Structure 1
Amino acid sequence: LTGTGVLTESNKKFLPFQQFGRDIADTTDAVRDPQTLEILDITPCSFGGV
């Protein structure tokens, strides 16, 4: 996988075989660390008009 965002500790308890999660509109929003097997949310980095 790839992308860019801040990895905050989430609470979405995944299934023992699921690796990453996708919210509506098919966007990667949560992945599981392959080493510690913890889940975390993927929030896109801040952006907006000046």
Structure 2
Amino acid sequence: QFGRDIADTTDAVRDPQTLEILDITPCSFGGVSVITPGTNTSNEVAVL
């Protein structure tokens, strides 16, 4: 009924009404980082 990763965490499932296999991938997330020249030099920024 369920799948597992090596670190013993769920990563796939049986859909219980149509028995095809669904991979569960975690929702996209991460750090937000602001690239900037010195605020004395310019007021512009770029975002990673």
Same topology, TM > 0.5 = yes
Which residue in 2 is equivalent to 1:24? 6
How many pairs does the alignment contain? 32
What is the CA RMSD across the aligned residues, in angstroms? 0.5
Mark the runs of 5 or more structure 2 residues left unpaired by the alignment: 33-48
Greater C-alpha Rg: 2
The ranges of structure 1 where at least 4 consecutive aligned residues each deviate by more than 4 angstroms after the TM superposition are: none
TM-score (normalised: structure 1): 0.61
What is the CA–CA distance in structure 2 between the aligned matches of 1:42 and 1:35, rounded to whole Å?
Answer: 17
Task: Determine helix, strand or coil for the equivalent of 1:30.
Answer: strand
Separation (CA, whole Å) in 2 of partners of 1:23 and 1:47: 19
Q: AA paired with 2:2? A: F
Structure in which a larger fraction of residues adopt strand: 1
Q: Which residue of 1 aligns with 2:36?
A: none
Percentage identity across paired residues of the two chains? 100
Unaligned runs of 5+ in 1: 1-18
Q: Which has the higher contact order (CA 8 A, sep 6+)?
A: 1
